[PDB]
Design a protein around this ligand. Structure first.
Ligand SMILES: Nc1ncnc2c1ncn2[C@@H]1O[C@H](COP(=O)(O)O)[C@@H](O)[C@H]1O
Ligand SMILES: Nc1ncnc2c1ncn2[C@@H]1O[C@H](COP(=O)(O)O)[C@@H](O)[C@H]1O
Lengths: 92, 42, 285
């Protein structure tokens, strides 16, 4: 079981990428921190809002860790789906 | 430079296997805890 | 209310009360290949899983062994759960049957029986989250904890015959020589969980479940084979009409099995008492 996803690129690019990704998804975001975000998304089908928080940690000398955290249809499953879409774009 | 049971609400994943992705996280309902595993095709 | 303490007890407790402090919940996206879903079921060690439809953004029902029976009775593995549910228009004809955490256990048993199902998803109306999957098994265990620690109603001493709990007619069965594919047919036709296996004189020598049928299918080696030959690939709890309802509950719960085969002195099958039979007796009446 792996927490979040990883990248050995540069924090500038990593964050730059997520925002580019967030944009394609047509997701609302808010930079609370150079490396800490806050995302929203109205549900096209149920017409409700679901929000998560991104946060880039650092694990070792050259590796980085992007953390997804849910924020208080189905809340839980939609949280999985929001992430799944992001991780898909990032993985391209 | 970027920052370095708190795992609550955090996204976890098994390594993709044969086309299927498995996402998981532990959420709390009242005093109980539910770890949910979602199997979804890529 | 000594002779109705159990109904009162079930009315006074919520479904939330028997949810573990920490539990695991496996959910399948309906676009999952039926093959992968099954292996996922096996590797997680569960019998059924809630279904999430991404298109509808909603839980649309359960994936149970019965569904595999239906499919198999009629490439099968390569297709998506969606596709197969579509063939039967499952969503429309038999919509999701769920329940709230704050609903009473009594409502859980009522619903299980009324809707002739075995899996009842506990869903929070607030968040829409599936919290847990209710079963007769789990509900009976809960009830048991209360039964063996609270003065019992006199009717818990009355025998099986006296209470007429169970099914003693139309009993669907198989013979040792019955081809598995024939057993398959009688499953879909009688909508029954398990088939007593009887010998030449009609004596019960084994039990055959839907699970057994599907496991054999997984091996992929025709179905023509008889039931006993098939049962050799594996890896019989019975009762008498003169035994106390209490003793039957006890046997059924600790054996952790789904039903008892009611039987003659010569072990000729007279009937069957399942968990649902017990629940309906204890709670619904
Ligand atoms: N909670 C439920 N809601 C809707 N359909 C169900 C539910 N549980 C079981 N089913 C369906 O009922 C049939 C028998 O399921 P079971 O009784 O659980 O073996 C299967 O085809 C299931 O898809
Ligand atoms: N082999 C069988 N033949 C006829 N009826 C059965 C059989 N097994 C179970 N039943 C009945 O079908 C109902 C559902 O039982 P179950 O499928 O075991 O939950 C119960 O009331 C049983 O008495």
């Amino acid at each position: 079981w792996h927490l979040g996803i990883r990248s050995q690129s540069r924090p500038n690019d990593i964050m730059a990428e997520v925002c580019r990704a967030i944009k394609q998804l047509d997701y609302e975001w808010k930079v609370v921190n150079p490396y800490y975000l806050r995302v929203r998304r109205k549900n096209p089908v149920t017409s409700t809002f679901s929000k998560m928080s991104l946060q880039l940690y650092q694990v070792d000398s050259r590796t980085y860790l992007l953390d997804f955290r849910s924020i208080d249809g189905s809340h839980t499953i939609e949280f999985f789906e929001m992430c799944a879409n992001l991780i898909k774009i990032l993985a391209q | 430079a970027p920052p370095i049971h708190v795992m609550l609400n955090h996204l976890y994943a098994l390594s993709i296997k044969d086309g299927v992705m498995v996402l998981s996280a532990t959420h709390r309902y009242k005093k109980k805890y539910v770890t949910t595993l979602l199997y979804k095709p890529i | 209310s000594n002779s109705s303490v159990y109904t009162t007890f079930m009315k006074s407790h919520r479904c939330y009360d028997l949810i573990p402090t920490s539990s695991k919940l496996v959910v399948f996206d309906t676009s999952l290949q039926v093959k992968k879903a099954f292996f996922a079921l096996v590797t997680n060690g569960v019998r059924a899983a809630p279904l999430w439809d991404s298109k509808k953004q909603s839980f649309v029902g359960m994936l149970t062994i019965t569904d595999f029976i239906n499919i198999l009775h009629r490439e099968l593995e390569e297709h998506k759960i969606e596709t197969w549910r579509e063939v039967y228009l499952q969503d429309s004809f038999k919509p999701l049957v769920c329940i709230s955490p704050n609903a009473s256990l009594f409502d859980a048993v009522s619903s299980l029986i009324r809707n002739k199902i075995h899996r009842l998803p506990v869903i929070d109306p607030e968040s829409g989250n599936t919290l847990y999957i209710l079963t007769h098994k789990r509900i009976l265990k809960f009830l048991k904890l209360f039964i063996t620690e609270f003065p019992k109603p006199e009717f818990m001493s009355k025998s099986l015959e006296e209470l007429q709990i169970g099914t003693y007619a139309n009993i669907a069965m198989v013979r040792t020589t019955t081809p598995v594919y024939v057993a398959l047919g009688i499953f879909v036709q009688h909508r029954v969980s398990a088939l007593p296996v009887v010998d030449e004189k009609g004596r019960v020598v084994d039990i055959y479940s839907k699970f057994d049928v599907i496991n054999l299918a997984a091996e992929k080696t025709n179905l023509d084979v008889s039931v006993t030959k098939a049962l050799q690939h594996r890896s019989v709890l019975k009762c008498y009409l003169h035994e106390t309802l209490e003793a039957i509950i006890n046997r059924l719960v600790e054996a952790e099995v789904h039903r008892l085969v009611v039987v003659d002195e010569h072990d000729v099958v007279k009937g069957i008492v399942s968990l649902s039979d017990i629940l309906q007796a204890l709670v619904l009446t």
